[PDB]
RNA sequence: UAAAUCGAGAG
DNA sequence: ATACGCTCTCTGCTTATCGGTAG
DNA sequence: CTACCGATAAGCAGATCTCTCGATTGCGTAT
């Protein structure tokens, strides 16, 4: 749903690199590989953490019982 | 069960009988009258179905015994039915007896003398004197001679009975075996059939009205005819009430008591009770106790019982008819209007029928009328009934079920149980003086700390639960465990602690389906701390057929020491190394360990001292009892300089040295493995494994060495050192290979799947040659010459013709398949292992495919070379109507790819058409897999139901449950199948002579044996057999029997089978090798004495499993259906009969090919080219011209000349044609041939006209034999007939020449040397004539019933064995002839060809077996009308009553030797 | 639609009197039109109900079925009409009789449904059901059949 | 607390 | 709002009826 | 000529491993 705190395979913290990854892809016209390299994700175990995240929580957040629409 | 509560009584036998109306009225506590179950406020209304006299109901004390719902056993009531109603169970026999009765004289319509004769025969059969029964028929030599005949017959029967009783044969209770039961059934069937065949009574010859049962609930009797009414004077439609039938049959049965005393009793009627017709009428119903009629509840939803609904309906109808009876009774005193009588009597008759239908519905649903509520019968009959669902198979306590996971570090005889199961499952341990150390701590630990205790059972039976208790209370209770009882009544008893399952407990592990007995073993419990799965060693997966794909299985916890010792000794997983099907092992390391050992036992495996010692200690820990010497002994290194190195073979050697017991020599084995020497380079000898003195010196350890494989290292260790050592070696090897794989890993990748550039070049070059295979195959089939272009119009036309036929396209798809498979074989031969980029042993795909760890050569061929031809049910890809195999292929395309030849491989992928064809093949495979499992269970069920009682007796003979002999010795040699693997491995036993001598040890087995008599008799028999045995088998007079017949092989050393002795003598002769032949023969004879099957072995169950379980892997019928023909149905009408005929060496193949044409049938249609019917009406005319093939053609193909054909037409064809024409009319009434003829032809025409009905012309081509024209005149009134379908039907059924029951003879290629003619029919008598061509003495036939008919019983039995043998020979399945021999002997025990089904089992002493099998109610009626009494001898019979079995541990008793008198 | 054609093919059914040859009065009763209303509720003026309510209430998502009869007497002499309701008829989501028919994904999210909610299934007692498509013989085409069971239809049967 | 039937699955 | 009547089988056995004997 | 012994054509019966979930359970007058 939301970005994992740590890479499963090794344990490197990657939860602080999701908004940064989206911003790197968005403003700077970068490909995914270069953006991942700039974030410091070297091993592919860490690279597929942010490369393949779907970020489903946003789709969850639009259904809000506690606020009128 | 509680071992501290002995039961002093025991049920020995049960007997069936009718519950008379008088007794139920006495046993009943209350009768029910109001069909309302419970009144308002929910209280049960007195007198209703729920009455307090029928049992405690919903917190109401029972009015009978005064006990609450828990302690009230329940009591039975009854319903007073106003009229006697037919019992639906006995209705058929009652209808048989009602017919064939004389209403006037009250006797049967059969004469009294014949009836008395049958009564005498039945009474003789009551005592088993089947011999005297037929000798009674030899007494036959007005009105006074018959009385003297009856007196003499009675005197003879009495004399025979008295002599047989006095001559030590029979007791007062008669002899009842299967054969006498079969004879009694046959005689009673003949009796009943004869009764139904009468015109009038033979004591007062007056006709009686003919009854007619329309359905149940009603019998209609036709009125006597006018002419038959006359005789009732000269000798001086209608409904019938139940009371009239009862009166008629009561009178008849009172008259014929002396005869029905022997029809309704299979044994001497000691009680002398009269057989009454009231037994067939249930004047009073019996209601079961309310405990068995309780209402179902789910919260608010409360529903009453269905039996209550049926009984309420019966009561309602009863009250209605009683009211009608009262209404008639009031008018009986003062009749007013007969019309009111008319209507009330019609209503009363309707009430009679309605109440009878109510009773029928209450007992049998299918006998009701007007989905319905099941009756009592419907609750017992089929699966989900009461016999198959709650007696033969029950649900059990102290059992868990879970999904399994693999676990090494488990001792291969252990099961790893979760902590949850260790907390829930418990065992009652009685507290003793040696036990309080552990039981006190178990009580203290409580129910939630393993090991712990969950309950305490005091002496009086109090069950103090430890669940809701604190630790202090638990210490108080634990300190009072071994406190002596204060009560005298229980002073012999001690408390029991329901302790948790421990590491010393045993458990019964089973995985469904349980095809064979090895799928249910006993494992020692080890409890694990982590997860909720049953952890199982890999070696157990072979027998359970278990993977770890979410498979689940069941653990059972035996709750007494008797079942503990069985699972630890009899169901023990160590005892299950060899399967009883064929003696092959079914245990061994499976997938990773095999490749691990292939790597470890290679020549490249060098280990430093640290690595060697760590590998050795990683599996032989000398604190768990893994080794014997208390100190791990190592070996000098293979290489001393430059630095010390060991070898993997040395690792195996020291593993064996540590596990093998001391004071015993090492193993000596010369074997082979699965990897050829060419896979190790030039000059290698690693294919041959060589253990010498317990040291591995050559070869690789493989699947064939450790694993389910014969004559490996593990098999040899099992045979020499025992089963426990073999299990220990399996565990040690598993741990060793696990620790070797965790330090030296094994992997497979994409590099292993590649070919070199030259390999790909070879593959492409070979596959390019396949561009013309399909066209050439088509040209061969289409008979075009060769090189014909694929779009040749003639080729296309003939291809279309081939497609439209299911047989011609069946040979097209077989010829092309052979060529494309040859191309595939060329590709595979060229491109592996030569074309592979990586080579074995580096190529792990080939490493694990060659070693047998996983996969095969075809798998790697498909991965790396090509998929090959895709076969759909033996054919190629199906074809559409248009002739296209797929939308992308042009019609009738002569391509291998079009037909389903995949040139692609899984490495490079496959094209969409190849993908589609492969999907077809995979779907067909899945369909076959699903349909095969459902097709095999019934065979095993049928075999197991009948063979379950067959077992080995202490006479060393095997016989059924009730004592009937089946075999005199198991297989003729009394040898266990699981102990004869190394009996004939004479060189292996010689090389390990001292090791085997250490275990067999003759020096301790001399005080309890006879040593010389059996040897002397064997010497005499061997000398005589050698002197003789050059002449045919029938000529050999048997002066000396084989030693097994006279001397018990288990008690006389040297008493062995002739085959074993001859093979031993041949071995001792061929090679002469400090062991001499005398000591070796003594050792082998002792080994034979120890290789015998134990008395009490469930041999029949084992045979049924060994015939059924291998049947899972599964022109003439072939496979499981063939078995269905043999075992299940015993079909005399075999689907495809065959007959084998030997050939004298004198005859030549030129004569042989023509002899098969002199026997094969020839229909008239096989020579007719065409038939022309010229019909001209206005009398109808017909010119039935028959155009034949040329005389040179059919005179050669079928050897049929003009004269024979013409005679067949004149005599046979025209008669059948005219008969068919007349039949059709009867059922419908609702180039130019030369005109001139010669003199003889006119006379022949006149004769043919005269002999037949409506022929006015006839002629045959007497010069050339190529046509036959004849006229056919019919009446001018007749309408149109087809007259072509008639001729077509007749011609196919008109026969030129045929031997009866034979349609074709063949001359196949000789197989196993002998020349054989194979015929598609069975007629021995006709083949007996042809002594010139056929060796009549060697005619063996597929038909296992005709051989019984013409060659007796034993030839049929041999045929049964041979036919049930080659069904497994096609699939290459090893099943010993010992199982097949027993099955055949059981099928032919009565001298006939019996099947394994309900009809085959129709004769047996045990009623419970036949009831539990199928059709429970018919067998129950037969058992209760015959008043049969069963001694509870069948394995199924003892389960119904709950008694210990008569097989294995229940085949004897145990007696204590109390020291003081 | 198909409901109108089907109810037309049903036709008319008549029954006569027992009081005056002539049998009485014809009573040619039938149904001429049938309609399904989109599901609504009474919580005054009707308000649209959406499948979220049907799922949360664990009830059915059903519209209203209105059949208008044609109570005719004497072969069309006198015709009475009435729009009879016929209970709650279940409707399937994203159909032309559903309240999510042409809703955009944004509006679907606003009504709690889904971003890309698909229909094809009815809601009955809070449980979602669908009616499986079957394979049947092709329509209006006479195909030759050689079937052995035809011979079991009686004697003299090919 | 029960029973069928239907449906979906696992080996 | 409410109670009581209801359209593609395998193996035999078992039955009905059709000829021939001999009585 | 008539009664017994079979001899098929037709009709009828029973029948063709364990385990886990969920969902429904009827109508039709009469009073
Ligand atoms: Zn990582
Ligand atoms: Zn009681
Ligand atoms: Zn009489």
- Measured between alpha carbons, how far is residue B1252 from residues B229, B588, B811, B1205, B1256 in Å? 47, 80, 45, 18, 9
Structure tokens at B531: 């997860």
B741: three-class secondary structure by DSSP: helix
Say if residue B587 is in the same domain as residue B673: yes
Tell me if chain A has a CB within 8 Å of the CB of C56.
Answer: no
Q: Sign of torsion, CA B300 B301 B306 B309?
A: positive
Q: Between helices B648-659 and B723-741, what is the axis angle to 10°?
A: 140
Structure tokens at B1275: 């009446």
* Segment (H or E) for B239: strand B238-239
Instruction: Report d(CA B972, CA B954) in Å as an integer.
Output: 15
Structure tokens at B1140: 């084998």
In sequence order, the 6+-apart residues with CB closer than 8 A to the CB of B817 are B869, B871, B876
Q: Omega of the bond prior to B513 within 30 degrees of 0, cis?
A: yes
Nearest 10 degrees: Cα torsion B739, B740, B742, B745: -160
Say if residue B380 is in the same domain as residue B492: no
Distance B418 CA to ligand 2 centre (A): 45
Residue of C nearest to A67 (CA): C110
How is the beta sheet containing B1267-1270 ordered, strand by strand? B1168-1177, B1180-1188, B1267-1270, B1258-1260
Strand D contacted by B818 CB (< 7 A): no
Instruction: Report d(CA C124, CA C130) in Å as an integer.
Output: 10
From the list B702, B701, B575, B727, the residue with the least C-alpha distance to B648 is B701
Half-sphere exposure of B697 (CA within 13 A, CB side): 11
DSSP B454-473: EEEE-TT--EEESTT--HHH
Q: Sign of torsion, CA B714 B715 B721 B725?
A: positive
Distance B247 CA to ligand 2 centre (A): 38
From the list B320, B474, B188, the residue with the least C-alpha distance to B1422 is B188
Say if residue B1345 is in the same domain as residue B1442: no
Strand D contacted by B369 CB (< 7 A): no
E strand segments, B1027-1135: none
Distance A23 CA to ligand 1 centre (A): 21
Could you identify the residue written with the tokens 């790909």? B760
From the list B408, B865, B414, B743, the residue with the least C-alpha distance to B591 is B408
Structure tokens at B1363: 């036919």
From the list B859, B863, B849, the residue with the least C-alpha distance to B679 is B849
Say if residue B864 is in the same domain as residue B1000: no
How is the beta sheet containing B1139-1142 ordered, strand by strand? B1305-1306, B1316-1319, B1139-1142, B1340-1341
B281 DSSP assignment = B
Sort residue B513 into left (φ over 0), alpha (ψ -120 to 50) or beta.
Answer: beta
Do residues B571 and B519 lie in contact, with contact meaning Cβ atoms separated by under 8 Å? no
How far separated are the first and last CA of chain A, in Å rounded?
A: 23
DSSP B373-388: PP-TGGGTSSTTSSHH
B334: three-class secondary structure by DSSP: coil
The closest nt to B547, taking CA to C1', is D11
Say if residue B923 is in the same domain as residue B821: no
Q: Find chain C residues with C-beta within 8 A of A59's C-beta.
A: 115
Phi, psi of B453, rounded to the nearest 5 degrees? -130, 140
Domain interval for residue B783: 748-911
Structure tokens at C155: 């004697």
Say if residue B391 is in the same domain as residue B247: no
Say if residue B812 is in the same domain as residue B876: yes
Strand B238-239 vs strand B218-221: parallel, antiparallel, or unpaired? Answer: antiparallel
Residue B891 belongs to a domain with what CATH number?
1.10.132.30
- Which of C110, C112, C115 minimises the CB distance to A59? C115
Instruction: Report d(CA B845, CA B862) in Å as an integer.
Output: 12
Do residues B778 and B846 lie in contact, with contact meaning Cβ atoms separated by under 8 Å? no
Instruction: Report d(CA B715, CA B978) in Å as an integer.
Output: 12
Do residues B270 and B172 lie in contact, with contact meaning Cβ atoms separated by under 8 Å? yes
B1052: three-class secondary structure by DSSP: strand
Residue B1088 belongs to a domain with what CATH number?
1.10.357.120
Do residues B529 and B423 lie in contact, with contact meaning Cβ atoms separated by under 8 Å? no
- Measured between alpha carbons, how far is residue B831 from residues B755, B771, B839, B901, B908 in Å? 8, 19, 12, 18, 15
How far separated are the first and last CA of chain B, in Å rounded?
A: 32
Query: Chain A neighbours among C 93-112 (CB < 8 Å)?
Result: 109-110, 112
Structure tokens at B76: 């039975």
Instruction: Report d(CA B826, CA B707) in Å as an integer.
Output: 32
Structure tokens at B981: 């693997």
Q: Between helices B773-782 and B808-831, what is the axis angle to 10°?
A: 150
Asked if residue B919 belongs to a known ligand binding site, the reply is no
Structure tokens at B23: 């007794």
Technique behind this structure?
cryo-EM
In sequence order, the 6+-apart residues with CB closer than 8 A to the CB of B112 are B146, B202, B203
Tell me if chain A has a CB within 8 Å of the CB of C114.
Answer: no
Distance B988 CA to ligand 3 centre (A): 83
Q: Find chain A residues with C-beta within 8 A of C115's C-beta.
A: 59
Residue B571 belongs to a domain with what CATH number?
2.40.40.20
Asked if residue A7 belongs to a known ligand binding site, the reply is yes
Asked if residue B137 belongs to a known ligand binding site, the reply is no
Do residues B1360 and B1147 lie in contact, with contact meaning Cβ atoms separated by under 8 Å? no
From the list B697, B702, B707, the residue with the least C-alpha distance to B679 is B702
Give A63 to chain C, closest Cα distance, Å: 6
Strand D contacted by B296 CB (< 7 A): yes
What residues does each domain of chain A span? Answer: 1-66
Instruction: Report d(CA B835, CA B866) in Å as an integer.
Output: 13
Say if residue B44 is in the same domain as residue B192: no
> Could you tell me the distance in Å between the CA of residue B388 and the C1' of nucleotide D5?
22
Tell me if chain A has a CB within 8 Å of the CB of C52.
Answer: no
How far separated are the first and last CA of chain C, in Å rounded?
A: 42
Strand E contacted by B1131 CB (< 7 A): yes
Q: Sign of torsion, CA B981 B987 B993 B997?
A: positive
In sequence order, the 6+-apart residues with CB closer than 8 A to the CB of B1071 are none
Say if residue B485 is in the same domain as residue B520: no
Say if residue B917 is in the same domain as residue B906: no
Ligand in nearest proximity to the CA of B208: 3
Structure tokens at B1353: 């019983």
CA B1332 to chain centre: 43
From the list C52, C48, C53, C30, the residue with the least C-alpha distance to C38 is C48
Q: Sign of torsion, CA B1103 B1109 B1110 B1112?
A: positive
Strand F contacted by C127 CB (< 7 A): yes
Kindly tell me whether chain A and chain C come into contact, counting contact as 3+ Cβ pairs under 8 Å. Answer: yes
Asked if residue B51 belongs to a known ligand binding site, the reply is no
Instruction: Report d(CA B1460, CA C83) in Å as an integer.
Output: 103
- Asked if the Cβ–Cβ distance from A63 to C115 is below 8 Å, we say no
| CATH number at A1-66 | 1.10.10.60
Strand F contacted by B92 CB (< 7 A): no
């Amino acid at each position: 749903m939301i970005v994992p705190v740590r890479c499963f395979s090794c344990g490197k913290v990657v939860g602080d690199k999701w908004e940064s990854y989206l911003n790197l892809l968005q403003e700077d016209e970068l490909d995914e590989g270069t953006a991942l390299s700039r974030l410091g994700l070297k091993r592919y175990c860490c690279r597929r953490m942010i490369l393949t995240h779907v970020d489903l929580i946003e789709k969850f957040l639009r259904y809000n019982p506690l606020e009128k629409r | 069960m509680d071992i501290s509560k002995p039961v002093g009584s025991e049920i020995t036998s049960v007997d069936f009988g009718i519950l008379t109306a008088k007794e139920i009225r006495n046993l009943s506590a209350k009768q029910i009258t109001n069909p309302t179950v419970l009144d308002n406020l929910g209280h049960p209304v007195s007198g209703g179905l729920y009455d307090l006299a029928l049992g405690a109901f919903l917190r109401n004390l029972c009015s009978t015994c005064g006990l609450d719902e828990k302690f009230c056993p329940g009591h039975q009531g009854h319903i007073e039915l106003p009229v006697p109603c037919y019992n639906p169970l006995f209705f058929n026999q009652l209808y048989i007896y009602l017919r064939a009765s004389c209403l006037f004289c009250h006797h049967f319509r059969l004469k009294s003398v014949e009836v008395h004769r049958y009564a005498c025969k039945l009474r003789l059969l009551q005592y088993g004197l089947i011999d005297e029964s037929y000798k009674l028929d030899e007494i036959t030599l007005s009105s006074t001679l018959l009385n003297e005949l009856k007196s003499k017959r009675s005197e003879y029967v009495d004399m025979a009975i008295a002599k047989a009783l006095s001559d030590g044969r029979t007791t007062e209770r008669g002899s009842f075996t299967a054969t006498v039961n079969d004879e009694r059934k046959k005689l009673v069937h003949e009796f009943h059939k004869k009764l139904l065949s009468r015109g009038k009574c033979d004591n007062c010859g007056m006709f009686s009205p003919k009854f007619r049962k329309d359905g149940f609930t009603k019998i209609f009797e036709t009125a006597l005819n006018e002419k038959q009414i006359t005789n009732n004077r000269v000798k001086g439609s209608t409904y019938i009430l139940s009371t009239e039938v009862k009166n008629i049959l009561d009178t008849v049965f009172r008259k014929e008591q002396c005869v029905l005393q022997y029809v309704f009793h299979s044994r001497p009627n000691l009680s002398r009770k009269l057989v009454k017709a009231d037994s067939f009428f249930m004047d009073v119903l019996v209601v079961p106790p309310t405990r068995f009629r309780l209402p179902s509840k789910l919260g608010e939803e409360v529903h009453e019982n269905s039996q209550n609904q049926l009984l309420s309906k019966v009561l309602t109808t009863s009250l209605l008819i009683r009211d009608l009876n009262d209404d008639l009774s009031k008018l009986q005193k003062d009749k007013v209007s007969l019309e009111d009588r008319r209507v009330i009597f019609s209503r009363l008759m309707n009430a009679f029928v309605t109440i009878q239908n109510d009773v029928n519905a209450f007992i049998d649903s299918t006998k009701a009328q007007g989905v319905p509520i099941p009756g009592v019968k419907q609750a017992l009959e089929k699966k989900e009934g009461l016999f198959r669902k709650h007696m033969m198979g029950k649900r059990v306590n102290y059992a868990a079920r879970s999904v399994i996971s693999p676990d090494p570090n488990i001792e291969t005889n252990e099961i790893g149980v979760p902590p949850v199961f260790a907390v829930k499952l418990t065992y009652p341990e009685p507290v003793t003086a040696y036990n309080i150390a552990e039981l006190r701590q178990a009580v203290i630990n409580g129910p939630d700390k393993w090991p712990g205790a969950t309950q305490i059972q005091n002496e009086d039976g109090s069950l103090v639960s430890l669940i809701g208790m604190s630790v202090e209370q638990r210490k108080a209770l634990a300190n009072q465990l071994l406190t002596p009882s204060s009560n005298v009544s229980t002073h012999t008893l001690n408390k029991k602690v329901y302790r948790h399952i421990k590491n010393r407990d045993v458990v019964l592990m089973n995985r469904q389906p349980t095809l064979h007995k090895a799928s249910m073993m006993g494992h020692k419990v080890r409890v694990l701390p982590n997860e909720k799965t049953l952890r199982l060693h890999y070696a157990n997966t072979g027998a359970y057929n278990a993977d770890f794909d979410g498979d689940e299985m069941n653990m059972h916890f035996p709750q007494n020491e008797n079942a503990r010792a069985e699972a630890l000794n009899l169901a023990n997983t160590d005892s299950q190394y060899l399967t009883p099907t064929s003696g092959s092992p079914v245990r061994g390391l499976i997938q990773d360990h095999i490749s691990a050992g292939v790597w470890l036992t290679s020549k490249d495996s060098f280990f430093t001292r640290e690595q060697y010692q760590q590998y050795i200690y990683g599996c032989i820990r000398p604190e768990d009892g893994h080794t014997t010497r208390s100190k791990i002994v190592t070996l000098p290194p293979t290489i001393f300089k430059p630095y010390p190195l060991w070898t993997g073979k040395q690792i195996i050697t020291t593993v064996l040295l540590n596990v093998t017991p001391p004071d015993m020599p090492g193993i000596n084995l010369i074997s082979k493995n699965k990897i050829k020497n060419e896979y190790w380079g030039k000059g290698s000898l690693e294919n041959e494994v060589l253990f010498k003195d317990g040291a591995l010196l050559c070869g690789i350890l493989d699947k064939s060495q450790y694993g389910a494989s014969k004559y490996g290292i593990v098999h040899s260790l099992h045979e020499v050192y025992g089963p426990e050592v073999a299990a220990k070696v399996l565990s040690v090897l598993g741990r060793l290979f696990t620790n070797y794989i965790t330090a030296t890993a094994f992997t497979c990748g994409m590099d292993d799947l590649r070919l070199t550039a030259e390999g790909n070049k070879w593959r492409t070059d070979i596959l390019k040659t396949s561009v013309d295979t399909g066209r050439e195959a088509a040209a061969e089939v289409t008979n075009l010459d060769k090189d014909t272009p694929a779009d040749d119009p003639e080729l296309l036309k003939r291809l279309q013709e081939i497609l439209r036929d299911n047989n011609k396209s069946g040979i097209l798809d077989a010829v092309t398949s052979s060529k494309v498979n040859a191309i595939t074989s060329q590709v595979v031969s060229k491109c592996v292992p030569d074309g592979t980029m990586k080579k074995f042993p580096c190529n792990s795909m080939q490493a694990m495919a060659l070693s047998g760890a996983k996969g095969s050569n075809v798998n790697v061929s498909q991965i790396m070379c090509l998929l090959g031809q895709q076969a759909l049910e033996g054919r190629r890809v199906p074809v559409m109507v248009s002739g296209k195999t797929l939308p992308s292929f042009k019609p009738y395309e002569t391509d291998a790819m079009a037909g389903g030849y995949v040139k692609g491989r899984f490495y490079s992928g496959i094209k969409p058409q190849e993908y589609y064809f492969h999907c077809m093949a995979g779907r067909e495979g899945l369909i076959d897999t699903a349909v095969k499992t459902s097709r095999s269970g019934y065979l095993q069920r049928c075999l197991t139901k009948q063979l379950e009682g067959v077992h080995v007796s202490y006479d060393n003979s095997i016989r059924d449950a009730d004592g009937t002999l089946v075999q005199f010795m198991y297989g003729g040699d009394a040898i266990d199948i699981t102990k004869e693997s190394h009996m004939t491995q004479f060189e292996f036993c010689l090389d390990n002579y001292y090791a085997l001598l250490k275990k067999y040890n003759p020096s301790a087995l001399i005080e309890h044996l006879d040593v010389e008599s059996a040897l002397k008799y064997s010497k005499k028999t061997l000398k005589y057999r050698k002197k003789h045995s050059k002449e045919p088998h029938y000529k050999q007079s048997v002066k000396y029997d084989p030693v097994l017949a006279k001397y018990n092989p288990a008690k006389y050393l040297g008493s062995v089978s002739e085959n074993f002795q001859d093979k031993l003598e041949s071995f001792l002769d061929k090679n002469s090798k400090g062991v001499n032949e005398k000591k070796f023969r003594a050792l082998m004879q002792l080994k034979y004495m120890r290789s015998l099957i134990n008395p009490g072995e469930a041999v029949g169950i084992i045979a049924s499993q060994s015939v059924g379980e291998p049947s899972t892997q599964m022109n003439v019928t072939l496979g499981i259906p063939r078995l269905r023909e043999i075992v299940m149905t015993a079909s005399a009408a075999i689907k495809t009969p065959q007959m084998t005929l030997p050939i004298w060496n004198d005859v030549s193949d030129e004569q042989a090919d023509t002899f098969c044409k002199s026997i094969s049938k020839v229909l008239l249609s096989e020579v007719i080219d065409k038939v022309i019917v010229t019909e001209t009406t206005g009398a109808r005319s017909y010119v039935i011209h028959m155009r034949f093939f040329d005389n040179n053609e059919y005179s050669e193909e079928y050897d049929v000349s003009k004269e024979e054909l013409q005679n067949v037409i004149s005599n046979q064809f025209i008669h059948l044609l005219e008969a068919a024409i007349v039949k059709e009319i009867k059922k419908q009434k609702r180039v130019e041939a030369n005109n001139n003829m010669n003199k003889v032809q006119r006379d022949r025409q006149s004769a043919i006209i005269s002999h037949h009905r409506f022929i006015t012309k006839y002629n045959f081509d007497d010069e050339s034999g190529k046509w036959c024209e004849f006229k056919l005149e019919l009446a001018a009134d007749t309408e149109k007939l087809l007259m072509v379908n008639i001729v077509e039907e007749i011609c196919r059924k008109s026969i030129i020449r045929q031997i009866p029951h034979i349609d074709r003879c063949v001359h196949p290629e000789p197989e196993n040397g002998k020349r054989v003619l194979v015929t598609e029919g069975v007629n021995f008598q006709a083949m007996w004539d042809q002594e010139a061509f056929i060796d009549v003495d060697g005619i063996t036939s597929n038909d296992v019933a005709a051989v019984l008919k013409t060659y007796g019983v034993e030839a049929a039995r041999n045929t049964i064995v041979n036919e049930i043998n080659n069904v497994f020979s096609r699939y290459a399945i090893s099943v010993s002839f010992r199982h097949l021999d027993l099955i055949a002997d059981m099928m032919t025990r009565q001298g006939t060809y019996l099947a394994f089904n309900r009809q085959g089992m129709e004769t047996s002493t045990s009623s419970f077996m036949k009831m539990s099998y199928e059709t429970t109610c018919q067998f129950l009626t037969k058992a209760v009308l015959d008043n049969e009494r069963e001694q509870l001898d069948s394995p199924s019979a003892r389960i119904v009553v709950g008694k210990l079995n008569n097989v294995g541990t229940g085949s004897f008793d145990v007696l204590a030797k109390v020291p003081n008198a | 639609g198909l409901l109108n054609l089907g109810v037309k093919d049903i036709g008319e059914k008549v029954i006569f009197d027992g009081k005056p040859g002539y049998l009485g009065n014809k009573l040619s009763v039938s149904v001429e039109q049938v309609s399904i209303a989109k599901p609504m509720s009474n919580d005054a003026v009707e308000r649209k109900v959406y499948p979220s309510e049907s799922r949360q209430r664990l009830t059915s998502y059903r519209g209203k079925l209105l059949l208008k009869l044609k109570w005719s007497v004497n072969n069309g002499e006198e015709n009475l009409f009435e729009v009879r309701d016929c209970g709650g008829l279940p409707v399937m989501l994203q159909s032309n009789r559903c309240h999510l028919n042409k809703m955009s994904p944004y509006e679907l999210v606003q009504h709690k449904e889904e971003s890309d909610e698909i229909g094809g299934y009815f809601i009955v007692n809070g449980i979602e059901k669908l009616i499986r498509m079957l394979i049947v013989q092709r329509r209006n085409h006479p195909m030759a059949i050689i079937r052995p069971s035809f011979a079991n239809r009686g004697a003299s049967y090919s």
